């Protein structure tokens, strides 16, 4: 592997990562590809995807929002990164040479061309993967975990659910919390309607 054009085949752009924010096997299909993480002025450094991590900071990336990190490493220098800093630009000649030099200095053997050839098909086959298994439930659970509930049309459904939970729960503290949450939701809905 000595060309940039062949190396850009497995480059995971910022638009493709938005479709696997909650798909399983994220540590298998993603581990192996390279990304053009932006460091910051326009200089970029290619880093290897060692694995997957989870950050405690929740940030929104356009439409969706994820808090998962990405444990990268460039030769020897490693630290936590985020999926929002990745750029969509392809590996330039200067950055390609910089990455080659970093790999040679770090002693990490360059991945063989056949390795990239057989790895680039992983993303292609995962993209057209039929969601026949019970993965949609986990996806929706993860999405709703961070995504706040009131938005946008489920206000009445959420209010009914809160009332039902409060009625079912015989505890005093839980009842008070449910009543307070219901009152807050009703007040927010009234304010939105008035606006």
Partner 1 sequence: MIIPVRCFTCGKIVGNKWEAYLGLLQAEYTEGDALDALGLKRYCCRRMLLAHVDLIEKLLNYAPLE
Partner 2 sequence: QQPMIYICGECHTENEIKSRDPIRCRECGYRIMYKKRTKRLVVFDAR
Q: What are the residues binding partner 2 (CB under 8 A)? A: 130-132, 136-137, 139-140, 143-144, 147, 152-154, 157
Candidates 65-73, 106-114, 123-131, 150-158: pick the segment binding partner 1 (CB under 8 A).
Answer: 150-158
61: partner contacted, choices partner 1, partner 2, none (Cβ within 5-8 A by kind): none
Give whichever of 16 and 157 is closer to partner 1, judged by the CB atom: 157
| 30-65: burial string, b at 16+ Cβ within 10 Å, e else | bbbbbbbbbeeeeebbbbbbeeeeeeeeeeeeeeee
Give whichever of 128 and 152 is closer to partner 1, judged by the CB atom: 152
* Rounded (10°) CA dihedral 51, 56, 142, 47: -30
Give whichever of 109 and 152 is closer to partner 1, judged by the CB atom: 152
How many other β-carbons are positioned within 10 Å of the β-carbon of residue 24? Answer: 12
**Cα–Cα distance for residue pair 72/76, rounded to 1 Å:** 10
**Cα–Cα distance for residue pair 8/4, rounded to 1 Å:** 6
* Cα distances (angstroms) measured from residue 101 to each of 39, 109, 110, 117: 18, 12, 11, 22
Q: Are 49 and 32 in contact (CB under 8 A)?
A: yes
Is residue 152 within the footprint of partner 1 (CB under 8 A)? yes
Least distance from partner 2 to the Cβ atom of residue 89, Å: 24
168: partner contacted, choices partner 1, partner 2, none (Cβ within 5-8 A by kind): none
Give whichever of 100 and 143 is closer to partner 1, judged by the CB atom: 143
Is residue 153 within the footprint of partner 1 (CB under 8 A)? yes
Is residue 63 within the footprint of partner 1 (CB under 8 A)? no
| Residues shown for the chain | 195
Q: Please compute Rg for the chain using Cα positions.
A: 23
Least distance from partner 2 to the Cβ atom of residue 131, Å: 6
Least distance from partner 1 to the Cβ atom of residue 152, Å: 4
Least distance from partner 1 to the Cβ atom of residue 153, Å: 7
Give whichever of 113 and 127 is closer to partner 2, judged by the CB atom: 127
Six token digits for residue 150? 């009131």
Candidates 24-32, 84-92, 145-153, 174-182: pick the segment binding partner 1 (CB under 8 A).
Answer: 145-153
């Amino acid at each position: 592997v000595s060309l940039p054009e062949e190396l850009n085949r497995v480059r995971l752009s910022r638009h493709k990562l938005e479709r696997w924010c909650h798909m399983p096997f994220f540590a298998k299909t993603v581990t192996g590809c390279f990304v053009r993480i932006g460091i910051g002025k326009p200089v970029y450094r290619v880093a290897e995807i060692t694995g997957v991590v989870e950050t405690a900071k929740v940030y929104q990336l356009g439409g969706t929002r994820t808090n998962k990190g990405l444990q990268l490493r460039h030769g020897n220098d490693q630290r936590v990164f985020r999926l929002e800093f990745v750029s969509n630009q392809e590996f330039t000649e200067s950055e390609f040479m910089k990455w080659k030099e970093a790999m040679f200095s770090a002693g990490m053997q360059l991945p063989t061309l056949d390795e990239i050839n057989k790895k680039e098909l992983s993303i292609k086959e995962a993209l057209n993967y039929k969601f026949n298994d019970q993965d949609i439930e986990e996806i929706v659970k993860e999405k709703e975990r961070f995504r706040k509930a009131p938005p946008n049309y489920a206000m009445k459904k959420t209010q009914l659910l809160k009332e039902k939970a409060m009625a079912e729960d015989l505890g005093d503290q839980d009842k008070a919390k449910q009543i307070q949450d219901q009152l807050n939701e009703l007040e927010e809905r009234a304010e939105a309607l008035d606006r």
